[PDB]
Structures are given as C-alpha cells and as structure tokens.
Amino acid sequence: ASRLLDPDTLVELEGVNGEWFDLTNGTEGIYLATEVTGLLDPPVKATYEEPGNFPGARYLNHRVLRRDLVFGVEIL
C-alpha cells in the first residue's frame, strides 16, 4: 500500500498567566523543534538486593522519579 504519514497530533502550551501557544501550527510564531526527551514514560528507579552468597538478586521496590523534559522552540 501507498500512504502519507501525517499524524493528527496537536501540542499546545497554557502559560502561568493563561496565555496560549500552539506549538504545532505556530500562530504565535513559536513551534516545537526537532529534539524532545521526556514525553512518553516518566523515569523510574528500580531497587534490587543481593540474596547473600547465592545466584541473582531480589526486587525491593520501584519509584517514579520527576519528569525532566528537554525540548527546543523555534521562534520566527
């Protein structure tokens, strides 16, 4: 089959004063740039312990960390 991949994805920011930015269409002259880390799953720390002098390790706990999100905006 033949197909253009043009996703429906809309990205908007609402600021601390209630002003808005469309980062997809750029009607405020601002666009999200080609580098994003920290969308999708948040970071997790998983903790394990040694079972004494025996094979492997045992699961203790896991914790979701803060989401550190790194991106750029292109400003015309």
Partner: peptide, 14 residues
Amino acid sequence: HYDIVRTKEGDVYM
C-alpha cells in the same frame, strides 16, 4: 538489639 534500616538510596535491611 536489632536495627531495621531504610537508607535514602532505597536499601532496606536488618
């Protein structure tokens, strides 16, 4: 005595 310790990096032991 015995101690049950939970450390800030997440290790729990007795």
